[PDB]
Symmetry: C3
Subunit: 340 residues, 3 copies
């Protein structure tokens, strides 16, 4: 919500409360999303200041507050900042921001990250360029310097983050994206590559000094219809775990396909169907093994722009013998959302 607009500075304080429950058989440990309370909240601000007719400064901060923890020793489990960046945008030249922000490969993966609760499986947090990540400097350009309607490109530098776990670390890297949208249709490509840390190279799974992620998208978002597909591959980038041996690392190679189709009815119902499959190859000791494999049926009803409720069913196609121990059981999510 826009709570302040004076002297060329506008501030948007936003947030939501999501009452959320997951249903899965038994513990949910062998299921797609687990079982139990999953309630959480969000808080954020987005600011915009008019520096002059051609220059605009901006910043944003976004936090996740879990609502399924006790008030005791686990009070903080799963709380974190999601976004924290500031930047400048000038005329048609382009914009530059630095901070914690979405990796550039998410410009493609965003096409299919549209499901009520799930989906976007390959857009991992703190996983180089596929998702939210810290210390990224990002140049973006809209309509190619103002000369070509609908053509956009982005270049992003990723600073090295040497963290205490291999899962959340990364080295220096550079990535980019290009997208063109014309009359309902959209197509987009993005590529990113970066060094791996000594800690990552020391993990049992994944072998190499370089990480690579790329993805292409095709979408149609015209006349209440939404159709989108993604394809992508990664090298030494997708985080995996062998639950049998309790071995963590990265997949040497992955192949990912994401499809989504949705329709928005005028009375507020938005049915959703989707398919996602992520297979891994050349995993030490295993070889080929599916990481994600499911169909999705769900729907969201929108009471208005502030209130909505949704159901999300995952028809999980992972088999019970999966060599990494990926969960094979189904998961259904039910939620009620208030946002401002």
């Amino acid at each position: 919500a826009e709570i302040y607009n004076k002297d060329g500075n506008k501030v948007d304080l936003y947030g939501k409360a999501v009452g959320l429950h997951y249903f899965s058989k038994g513990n949910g440990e062998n299921s797609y999303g687990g079982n139990g309370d999953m309630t959480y909240a969000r808080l954020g601000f987005k600011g915009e200041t008019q520096i002059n007719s051609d220059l605009t400064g901006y910043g944003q901060w976004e936090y996740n507050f879990q609502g399924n923890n006790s008030e005791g020793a686990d009070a903080q489990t799963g709380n974190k900042t999601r976004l924290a960046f500031a930047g400048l945008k000038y005329a048609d030249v382009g914009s530059f921001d630095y901070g914690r922000n979405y990796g550039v490969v998410y410009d493609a993966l965003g096409y299919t990250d549209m499901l009520p609760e799930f989906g976007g499986d390959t857009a991992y947090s703190d996983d180089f360029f596929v998702g939210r990540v810290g210390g990224v400097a990002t140049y973006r350009n809209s309509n190619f310097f103002g000369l070509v309607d609908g053509l956009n490109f982005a270049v992003q530098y990723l600073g090295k983050n040497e963290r205490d776990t291999a899962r959340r670390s990364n080295g220096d890297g550079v990535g980019g994206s290009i997208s063109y949208e014309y009359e309902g249709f959209g197509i987009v490509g993005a590529y990113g590559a970066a060094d791996r840390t000594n800690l990552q190279e020391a993990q049992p799974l994944g072998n190499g000094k370089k990480a690579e992620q790329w993805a292409t998208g095709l979408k149609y978002d015209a006349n209440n219809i939404y159709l989108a597909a993604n394809y992508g591959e990664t090298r030494n980038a997708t985080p995996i775990t062998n639950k049998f041996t309790n071995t963590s690392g990265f997949a040497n190679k992955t192949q990912d396909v994401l499809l989504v189709a949705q329709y928005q009815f005028d009375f507020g119902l938005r049915p959703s169907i989707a398919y996602t499959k992520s297979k891994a190859k050349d995993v030490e000791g295993i070889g080929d093994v599916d990481l994600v494999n499911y169909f999705e049926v769900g729907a969201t009803y929108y009471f208005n722009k502030n209130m909505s409720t949704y159901v999300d069913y995952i028809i999980n196609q992972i088999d019970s013998d999966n060599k990494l121990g990926v969960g094979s059981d189904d998961t259904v999510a039910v939620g009620i959302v208030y946002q401002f």
Copy 2:
């Protein structure tokens, strides 16, 4: 404060800063509330969206920020989310919200939870239905479908929460409350029952597979006067600790009595007197033992709706030989509060 009201959506951003100090003899370890700085802050939002003439969506989130921690390794001690839920309310049919919210037995215990700083001893957090707890779905009904002025009832389902400590866990359960208010007087009853987890059943103190909590209330809240009483009992529900053996568990049986009397003077002074006693029975190795036993003398001065100050003295009647090692010393609280 209402910081946004447009297009049928209104948002309330609230919070407070409480400068707070406790005085107790010596170190305060053997006292009712301890000793030292107890400053803290609150931040929250409450939202309300008009879906139509009869339907109203809503959400709320509330956080506690301790202000008596260093900026180092203990920076987070005692920080937690207190409330996080969203819901819908329709006409006179009733309202339903899910998330972290007050257990239904608090509908009764609220009568006496009115002291400046202390009191409400039996409304434990993450203790089934007596206080704030996660993953509760709650239906409430005002004026019995619009047919009976002043008669309210509520039904609440508690999802199972298998946490890493028995103190903060719970199984599935159902509870309810009923209340009637007519011209200053209020009477209310509430009951709740739920399964215990394997972790709770494994604790030295407390024996049984089921937990039970109930409470009744009588109050008068007319003409600057406030008088209220609560009585209640619990089975295998009230959390207790034997400090001698460092044994934690639940009390097999408790009996609780809470009394409060207050008057609000027009110039801003609100004196308060109270009595609270909670005795436990059939505690393994102990038998009967008082958990809470004190008189309270205090007062709040209200400068206006935003500023207030208060003193709160606990005349602690727990004796020094108490078999569980409950603190026997007095405690005085002094505080200054800014809220918006």
Copy 3:
């Protein structure tokens, strides 16, 4: 930003997003400020309520949200409340607030704490009176009861805080400050003394039962110019570590000098030069040793009151043989800031 002003109560919701990176050779472990992403955000409120023509109530809360952590197990590293206090101010009699607030010796050290990113080296958090600290009651007086233009004084009581580390603890104490400002010039003195806890007295470094801190300031803040100097000394108060032996404690004696010079150009550029040196004496096993020793060159450009970017270079003069192992290498910070 002032997001609410009604019925005599005004609320200022503020915050910022700082995109920040440090450059230092290698890891930065042997450097002044380290190396890597240092992005962070702030959120805060400041409230003011008119009780009557002569009385005003107020409160403030301020939190630091780090933006250089993953979304995993380290999500909370470095998050903390910075300020949390409420108070009353009456006419010319004075103001009183209690809570977590700036120690009174910061009234002097503030003169030089003016650098874009660094500086203010001797204003340690949770270090008695030199910086932010919890449980302090503070009386302040402006213009000596309204009788003497420009003369201010402050008296502060520090409650004992027995924490789990000697670094962040303190005993009871009292301190004060006095300042006089006339036509661009400012001079200020402050002194504070307090008991040490048993845990602090048990540390290998630092010997004594009392802690003492004092500082004087001379500043000129007129006609776009800012010049300021500080000098100060401390006894058993400045926290130190011997990295060779991994021994933590306090410095028996320190001598600190801080100089800053800046000019604000009308087009938004504010160049900054500074010097800071803090030497320690009679450190057990070491004797005399420099704690801080550097020159500073930097600058901030102000696009307007909401947007700014800055560079901050530390010409580190600490030598590589320093007996405590204090870092000898340089550090450069680059940042982009959005605030509201």
